[PDB]
Amino acid sequence: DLIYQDEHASLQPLEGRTVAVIGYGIQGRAFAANLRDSGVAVRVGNIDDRYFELARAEGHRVTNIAEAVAHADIVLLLIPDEAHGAVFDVDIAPNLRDGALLCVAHGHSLVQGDVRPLPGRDLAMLAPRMYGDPIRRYYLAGQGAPAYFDIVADHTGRARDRVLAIARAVGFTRAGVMALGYRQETFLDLFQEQFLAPALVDLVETGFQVLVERGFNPKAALLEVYGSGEMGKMMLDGADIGLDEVVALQGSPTCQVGYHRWRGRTLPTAVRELAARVLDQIEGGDFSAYLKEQASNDYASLDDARRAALKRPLNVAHAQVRAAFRFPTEAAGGLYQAAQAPADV
Amino acid sequence: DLIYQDEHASLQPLEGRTVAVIGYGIQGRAFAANLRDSGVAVRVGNIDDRYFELARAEGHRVTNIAEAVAHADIVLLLIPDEAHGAVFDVDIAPNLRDGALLCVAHGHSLVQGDVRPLPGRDLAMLAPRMYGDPIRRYYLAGQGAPAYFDIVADHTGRARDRVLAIARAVGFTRAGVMALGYRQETFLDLFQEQFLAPALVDLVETGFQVLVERGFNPKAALLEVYGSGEMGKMMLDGADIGLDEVVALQGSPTCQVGYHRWRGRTLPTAVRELAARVLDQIEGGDFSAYLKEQASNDYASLDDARRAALKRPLNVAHAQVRAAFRFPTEAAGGLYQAAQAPADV
Numbered sequence: 001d002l003i004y005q006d007e008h009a010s011l012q013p014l015e016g017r018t019v020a021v022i023g024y025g026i027q028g029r030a031f032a033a034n035l036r037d038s039g040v041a042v043r044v045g046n047i048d049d050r051y052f053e054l055a056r057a058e059g060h061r062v063t064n065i066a067e068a069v070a071h072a073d074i075v076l077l078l079i080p081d082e083a084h085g086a087v088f089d090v091d092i093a094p095n096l097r098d099g100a101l102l103c104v105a106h107g108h109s110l111v112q113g114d115v116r117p118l119p120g121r122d123l124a125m126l127a128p129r130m131y132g133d134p135i136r137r138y139y140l141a142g143q144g145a146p147a148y149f150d151i152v153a154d155h156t157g158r159a160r161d162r163v164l165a166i167a168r169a170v171g172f173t174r175a176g177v178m179a180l181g182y183r184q185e186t187f188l189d190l191f192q193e194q195f196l197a198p199a200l201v202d203l204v205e206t207g208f209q210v211l212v213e214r215g216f217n218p219k220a221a222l223l224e225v226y227g228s229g230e231m232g233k234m235m236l237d238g239a240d241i242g243l244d245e246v247v248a249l250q251g252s253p254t255c256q257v258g259y260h261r262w263r264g265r266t267l268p269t270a271v272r273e274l275a276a277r278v279l280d281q282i283e284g285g286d287f288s289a290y291l292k293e294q295a296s297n298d299y300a301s302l303d304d305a306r307r308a309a310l311k312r313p314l315n316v317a318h319a320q321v322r323a324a325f326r327f328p329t330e331a332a333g334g335l336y337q338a339a340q341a342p343a344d345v
Numbered sequence: 346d347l348i349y350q351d352e353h354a355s356l357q358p359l360e361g362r363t364v365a366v367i368g369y370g371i372q373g374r375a376f377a378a379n380l381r382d383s384g385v386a387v388r389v390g391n392i393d394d395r396y397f398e399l400a401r402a403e404g405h406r407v408t409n410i411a412e413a414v415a416h417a418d419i420v421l422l423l424i425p426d427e428a429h430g431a432v433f434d435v436d437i438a439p440n441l442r443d444g445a446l447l448c449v450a451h452g453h454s455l456v457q458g459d460v461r462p463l464p465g466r467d468l469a470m471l472a473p474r475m476y477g478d479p480i481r482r483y484y485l486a487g488q489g490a491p492a493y494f495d496i497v498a499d500h501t502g503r504a505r506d507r508v509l510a511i512a513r514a515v516g517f518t519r520a521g522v523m524a525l526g527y528r529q530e531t532f533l534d535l536f537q538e539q540f541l542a543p544a545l546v547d548l549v550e551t552g553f554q555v556l557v558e559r560g561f562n563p564k565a566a567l568l569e570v571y572g573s574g575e576m577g578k579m580m581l582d583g584a585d586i587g588l589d590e591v592v593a594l595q596g597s598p599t600c601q602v603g604y605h606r607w608r609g610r611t612l613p614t615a616v617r618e619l620a621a622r623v624l625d626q627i628e629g630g631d632f633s634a635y636l637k638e639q640a641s642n643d644y645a646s647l648d649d650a651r652r653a654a655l656k657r658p659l660n661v662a663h664a665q666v667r668a669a670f671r672f673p674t675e676a677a678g679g680l681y682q683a684a685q686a687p688a689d690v
């Protein structure tokens with residue numbers, strides 16, 4: 001495995017270069033803020049929507065996508081994957097300078113052939129293993145999350161150095177940036193989002209629903225299954241030292257005995273078989289067809305699903321718990337500004 | 346629901362009083378450190394083992410359990426639940442002063458009748474919804490985790506004020522301290538440890554095993570299922586704003602569409618039915634019998650299970666990942682000392 005940390009990547013390839021962050025959403029905002037705070041010349045390219053004014057409000061040089069690309073040495077395409085094809089064809093390909101680098105943060109558009117190599121220009125993937133807020137929060141703490149990278153086309157011979165320079169400036173090399181094919185990254189990423197994340201929340205919800213049906217205080221039930229932050233803490237501490245190890249070190253003997261009675265015995269074959277089906281639907285292109293269909297609207301069915309989700313007993317109970325119990329939040333005040341808001345006492 | 350935050354609980358009931366922390370383990374150490382830093386007079390009562398010298402090393406007045414109880418107004422029994430009966434009968438009951446308060450952090454010993462009310466003395470439960478390290482780390486950040494409390498016996502009329510004074514000093518009232526019966530707390534707590542925690546780790550492991558069997562990079566597979574910290578971050582951010590809400594706010598449209606394709610559809614009836622069985626085994630006293638049997642040895646079978654757990658593919662892969670990727674850790678240097686170690690650069 002090829003893994004780069006801070007000492008394996010220089011900022012020198014970005015000196016006197018301009019990085020165009022295309023999009024100012026979940027990833028675009030975090031990339032833009034970290035690049036700027038790392039002393040990189042950054043511009044934002046964005047369509048005429050709320051994100052354009054947000055980028056301006058947070059002190060960035062903002063223009064349409066075409067002008068940003070045309071005045072950039074490195075272009076980071078940080079907009080939704082189903083929009084890549086149209087923006088690549090219309091905005092990026094006609095304006096990408098000779099010897100410039102285009103990066104995606106997900107391999108989907110590469111697998112589908114919506115983003116393709118261009119003569120005289122570099123193409124790469126730099127895919128964070130983390131969402132926007134934590135990438136920004138970690139960065140401010142001198143930390144970072146891992147990333148996968150893939151050099152798809154290196155026409156200049158500088159593609160790797162520039163990608164790893166972006167990675168260090170955004171903070172991914174503080175954890176590690178591992179070489180992984182865009183195809184494998186695509187399937188990995190989609191599998192986490194389609195099998196693991198839903199199954200994980202479904203499980204928490206099953207815990208809540210059984211407790212409430214059996215007459216347990218709904219606030220207490222919600223708190224134990226995730227609301228307290230304890231299961232989230234176990235998973236984040238587990239990420240560091242191992243999940244079984246967290247229980248061995250911080251579980252009472254009563255907890256450890258209970259845990260190890262059921263550890264490896266809880267799930268039937270049907271869960272493992274569902275994981276295989278999700279993966280086949282991802283690899284076979286069934287999901288890709290489903291996604292394109294959902295993106296045919298402005299994600300109308302997704303909007304309905306999000307709304308319906310919040311009416312579920314678990315999310316009704318959550319609102320009641322979070323109203324009654326204060327949570328240890330890190331204030332988001334000017335998190336993506338050059339200077340953050342005064343600390344909230 | 347009766348929930349106390351900082352403004353509903355005074356430190357005044359602890360002024361000129363001594364708190365004996367019995368045990369200096371996962372909970373005992375966090376209680377002792379927070380109480381001291383909150384300006385409470387704290388002593389440690391502990392048997393002649395490694396925890397005794399650790400308490401002394403961290404600057405505490407440490408004696409045997411009998412002497413600590415005898416010189417205390419409030420006694421916190423923070424040792425394993427199966428040891429409560431013998432320590433109550435031998436060390437606590439004969440030495441508990443007139444008008445003194447005994448607190449447990451779990452209702453198990455109360456349900457089993459191993460800890461019982463005593464004439465002229467107060468009995469209560471103050472059960473944190475969090476393990477030791479995070480209680481201490483939250484406290485240092487001016488934060489806290491929730492707790493459940495139950496006044497089992499109030500012979501003085503001061504039991505509630507003293508319990509909630511302990512809760513505020515240790516930091517639980519920064520989130521909220523909710524009245525909940527020791528019995529219900531017992532079953533809730535055991536259910537989280539026996540159904541949810543194992544099922545959660547089993548699920549993560551199922552994700553890892555299917556990916557590795559299907560030819561995915563084992564480091565990448567491990568990172569996606571928890572190793573990156575992303576799923577842990579989703580769960581901890583989810584604790585605050587809701588699990589579905591985290592995906593709605595920080596998920597890409599591709600992620601959100603994938604998530605909502607499978608959300609509420611991933612688990613068969615068998616999982617829900619297993620949750621019911623675990624709960625019946627807890628409520629019926631089957632687990633209690635199993636626990637007493639495991640505690641008959643010095644938890645010998647648990648030691649074997651912990652050792653075996655670390656040899657599993659997931660934990661072998663974890664060691665390889667954590668060697669190759671740096672994780673954003675909060676340094677544990679003198680975390681439980683009056684003054685913490687110099688910040689690790």
Ligand SMILES: NC(=O)c1ccc[n+]([C@@H]2O[C@H](COP(=O)([O-])OP(=O)(O)OC[C@H]3O[C@@H](n4cnc5c(N)ncnc54)[C@H](O)[C@@H]3O)[C@@H](O)[C@H]2O)c1
Pocket residue numbers: 250251252253254367368369370371372373391392394396397422423424425426428432449450451472473475476477
């Ligand atoms: N560990 C947690 O995260 C947690 C959370 C909530 C509730 N609790 C409750 O808190 C209590 C303490 O659990 P813990 O996890 O801190 O335990 P632990 O395993 O860390 O306990 C070790 C401590 O107990 C003492 N001890 C062990 N066996 C003893 C014995 N036979 N006689 C006397 N002292 C003995 C040791 O000297 C040491 O001080 C239990 O009632 C538990 O259910 C623990």
Ligand SMILES: NC(=O)c1ccc[n+]([C@@H]2O[C@H](COP(=O)([O-])OP(=O)(O)OC[C@H]3O[C@@H](n4cnc5c(N)ncnc54)[C@H](O)[C@@H]3O)[C@@H](O)[C@H]2O)c1
Pocket residue numbers: 022023024025026027028046047049051052077078079080081083087104105106127128130131132595596597598599
């Ligand atoms: N969100 C994450 O946590 C995350 C993590 C890793 C990878 N990624 C990848 O990063 C990329 C960005 O995802 P995101 O989550 O930041 O997205 P997002 O949903 O926040 O994207 C919103 C942004 O995209 C722009 N945009 C939306 N539709 C557009 C269109 N039709 N034409 C032009 N611009 C348009 C908006 O103007 C705004 O700037 C995707 O390739 C995604 O797969 C995201």
Ligand SMILES: [Mg+2]
Pocket residue numbers: 128129130189192
């Ligand atoms: Mg991802």
Ligand SMILES: [Mg+2]
Pocket residue numbers: 252254255451534535538
């Ligand atoms: Mg417990």
Ligand SMILES: [Mg+2]
Pocket residue numbers: 473474475534537
């Ligand atoms: Mg507990």
Ligand SMILES: [Mg+2]
Pocket residue numbers: 106189190193597599600
């Ligand atoms: Mg994704």
